[PDB]
Amino acid sequence: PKIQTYVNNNVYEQITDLVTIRKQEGIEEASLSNVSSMLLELGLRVYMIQQ
Amino acid sequence: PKIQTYVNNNVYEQITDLVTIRKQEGIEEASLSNVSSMLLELGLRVYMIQQ
């Protein structure tokens, strides 16, 4: 399903910076949406480890 | 700004489970949106560490 969330401008920029980096690393299809989805899942995994 | 992304049903459920847990831990205002935003920032931090 869709998730709609809100971040500060600095965090937003850091995610868009990662889109550029991901493309440079050969992920031609990288987008704000699919980078965000990957980061959200990574954060979920780490937060569950730290519980 | 707003971020709109998409996750599988299992990941979505795990995030909603964390909303329930966060409320149980005293975060009365926890929501899918604000849990997601916190996880997205955590994932960003970990991914940048692992670069």
Instruction: Give CA torsion, residues B31, B20, A45, A27, to 10 deg.
Output: -30
Residues of A in contact with B44 (CB under 8 A): 11, 14-15, 18, 39, 43
Contact between B31 and B19 under an 8 Å Cβ cutoff? The reply is yes
Distance CA B38, CA A46 (A): 12
Closest Cα in chain B to A44: B39
Contacts of B33 (CB under 8 A, 6+ apart): A3, A4, A5, A6
Q: What are the structure tokens assigned to B30, written together?
A: 């926890």
Distance CA B18, CA A4 (A): 16
Number of C-beta neighbours around residue A32 at 10 A: 16
Distance CA B1, CA A12 (A): 7
What's B15's domain CATH number? 1.10.10.450
The residue with tokens 């997601």 is B36
Q: What is the number of domains present in chain A?
A: 1
Q: What are the structure tokens assigned to A23, written together?
A: 């493309």
Q: Does B25 touch chain A (CB under 8 A)?
A: no
Its domain, for residue B11, covers 1-51
Resolution (A): 1.3
Residues of B in contact with A22 (CB under 8 A): none
